[PDB]
Design a protein around this ligand. Structure first.
Ligand SMILES: CCCCCCCCCCCCCCCC(=O)OP(=O)(O)OC[C@H]1O[C@@H](n2cnc3c(N)ncnc32)[C@H](O)[C@@H]1O
Ligand SMILES: [Mg+2]
Length: 567
């Protein structure tokens, strides 16, 4: 299984050894099973979608995948890998909504094809002719006869061949196209396994969106790499009823499931004690947390709320990675059983220094140990010099899981993927600030979002966290801290969402004073402005990640749903 150069060779091996073993079982409601596929059935569907793609002239071309969460997406993705089509996964179009995001990906990828369901094709095909022209082909893959796979021409695949374009969320700018090779998929899959240590006997459940990151290389490809059964449900099922995630873990004895930090909080806040009494989570040995700052308070609250249900905090597996690194770089608590946490000086962090406080203290959770034969270095963003111990700098990654570059973006590719430091070359600039401590990599935040006000460095998420809890009328997770230029000097602007219940009876001055008071105590900062926005109006990615730069653009252009303003 570890001699496989690509996932096409690998699934074909699994379709022989475990043909009748169930690979994916989809619960459309997060409760009852709706559909399933065996390794043999997944292989056959893949050869058939492949043959449909090759006859449709898609080989060597880029194809958008537009599918609802389900097994059709999975089959279309593996069909593209079998066919030699560069797949471009994306969130599907939704009703009463624009296709701007989708057209922008089509223009960037120079895609000639959209792969979708019969239902969506009948609703979007003419809109795609309007936007992309007649030479663009919206194809449906859900009604391909399985006998078509007899006409599949196996491409001569090498690991250096490009498999798919993984587009970034667009939190810091425009989505960029990550060129993920076949070797990138195989190398990182092994890296996830050197850390997760899963076996053919491991069970998995995943509500994560299948389009990108943890949902695709981990929720779809890792089950196939390890030869295990994965239970899958739509993210909306978990979001509406978080108990469905933990009930599935209990029901199928799931060993390995995980999600971003916010999901652990929602499970803790929205699961009743009667529901906790229906749970047995002793089966959960790896509970991963990635794609978002891991907060120490969230780890403790989950461990405390669910210890009666058998959850152990030793199961928490902190992990870090990005699309430019395929998926994972660091993970695990090392020789420790519990996620390593350091208590350091707040003002020190604002000064790129990690030191004890002698000064308010901050608690930082490690994002894991560098997994495998990859090399992580902490470098100064401007001087391109390697930071010493206790210094905070840009995380730099050199390894075989580093993507080939950004699609049709040559200048940015040389800048971010040709990182030179001292006598070293070939490093990827992650754009993430952090530091090395205890063999563990800690992450402080994103460079492009870092706020520099009054000669001090301020992390936007640290300020957003203070504002959300300042008044009950503020919606948590729906706020942005941005720097605007006032007379040549940088100042702080807060764009925060008000709660739907508090929108009509909102005391702008009272809540603004609660906000100014909290930011001054914790950050010694005075907001130039506080813009209160309507519930659900914050510029967000398709994932839900806040676009802070677009909040500053909208404040400066007046495009926000303003229900209140302070200046
Ligand atoms: C059968 C068993 C199943 C197997 C499952 C395996 C799956 C587990 C591996 C997930 C490893 C995590 C990667 C996430 C990718 C992504 O997140 O994709 P991407 O959209 O490119 O965002 C990138 C930016 O997210 C921010 N970020 C990511 N990790 C952060 C952190 N630990 N702490 C703070 N910030 C963080 C950061 O800023 C980063 O650069
Ligand atoms: Mg990024």
């Amino acid at each position: 299984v570890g001699q496989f150069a690509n996932f096409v060779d690998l699934l074909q091996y699994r379709a022989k050894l475990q043909a009748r073993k169930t690979v994916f079982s989809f619960l459309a409601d997060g409760e009852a099973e709706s559909a399933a596929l065996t390794y043999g059935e997944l292989d056959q569907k893949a050869q058939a979608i492949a043959a449909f793609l090759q006859a449709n002239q898609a080989q060597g071309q880029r194809a958008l995948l537009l599918y609802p969460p389900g097994l059709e997406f999975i089959g279309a993705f593996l069909g593209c890998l079998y066919a030699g089509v560069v797949a471009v996964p994306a969130y599907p179009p939704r009703p009463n909504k624009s296709f701007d995001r989708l057209h922008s990906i089509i223009q960037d990828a120079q895609a000639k094809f959209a792969l979708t369901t019969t239902e969506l094709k009948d609703k979007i095909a003419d809109r795609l002719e309007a936007l992309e022209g007649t030479d663009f082909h919206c194809l449906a893959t859900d009604q391909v006869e399985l006998i078509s796979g007899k006409n599949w021409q196996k491409p001569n695949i090498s690991g250096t061949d490009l498999a798919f374009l993984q587009y970034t969320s667009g939190s810091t700018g425009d989505p960029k196209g990550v060129m993920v090779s076949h070797h990138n998929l195989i190398h990182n899959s092994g890296l996830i396994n050197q850390g997760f240590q899963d076996t053919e006997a491991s069970m998995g459940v995943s509500w994560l969106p299948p389009y990108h990151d943890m949902g695709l290389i981990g929720g779809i490809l890792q089950p196939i790499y390890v030869g295990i059964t994965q239970i899958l449900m739509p993210p909306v099922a978990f979001l509406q009823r978080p108990f469905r995630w933990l009930k599935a873990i209990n029901d199928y004895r799931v060993s390995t499931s995980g999600a971003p930090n916010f999901a652990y909080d929602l499970c803790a806040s929205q699961i009743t004690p009667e529901q906790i009494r229906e749970l047995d989570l002793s089966c959960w040995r790896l509970a991963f947390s990635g794609a978002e700052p891991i907060r120490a308070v969230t780890l403790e609250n989950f461990a405390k709320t669910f210890a009666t249900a058998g959850f152990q905090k030793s199961a928490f597996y902190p992990c870090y990675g990005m699309a430019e690194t395929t998926l994972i770089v660091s993970g695990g608590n090392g020789a420790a059983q519990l996620p390593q946490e350091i208590i350091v000086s707040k003002q020190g962090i604002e000064a790129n220094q990690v030191r004890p406080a002698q000064e308010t203290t901050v608690t930082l959770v490690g994002s894991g140990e560098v997994i495998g034969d990859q090399i992580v270095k902490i470098v100064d963003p401007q001087a391109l010099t390697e930071c010493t111990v206790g210094e905070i700098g840009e995380v730099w990654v050199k390894g075989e899981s580093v993507a080939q570059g950004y699609w049709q973006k040559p200048d940015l590719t040389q800048q971010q993927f040709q990182g030179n430091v001292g006598a070293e070359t070939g490093f990827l600039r992650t754009g993430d600030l952090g530091f090395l401590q205890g063999g563990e990599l800690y992450i402080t935040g994103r460079l492009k979002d870092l706020l520099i006000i009054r000669g001090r460095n301020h992390y936007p998420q640290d300020i957003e966290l203070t504002v959300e809890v300042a008044h009950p009328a503020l919606r948590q997770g729906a706020g942005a801290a941005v720097s605007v230029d006032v007379n040549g000097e940088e100042q702080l602007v807060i764009v925060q969402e008000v709660e739907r219940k508090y929108a009509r009876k909102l005391n702008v001055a009272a809540v603004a004073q609660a906000i100014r008071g909290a930011i001054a105590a914790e950050h010694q900062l005075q907001p130039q402005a506080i813009c209160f926005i309507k519930p659900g109006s914050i510029p967000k990615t398709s994932s839900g990640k806040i676009r802070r730069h677009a909040c500053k653009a909208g404040f400066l252009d007046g495009s926000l749903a303003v229900v209140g303003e302070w200046q």
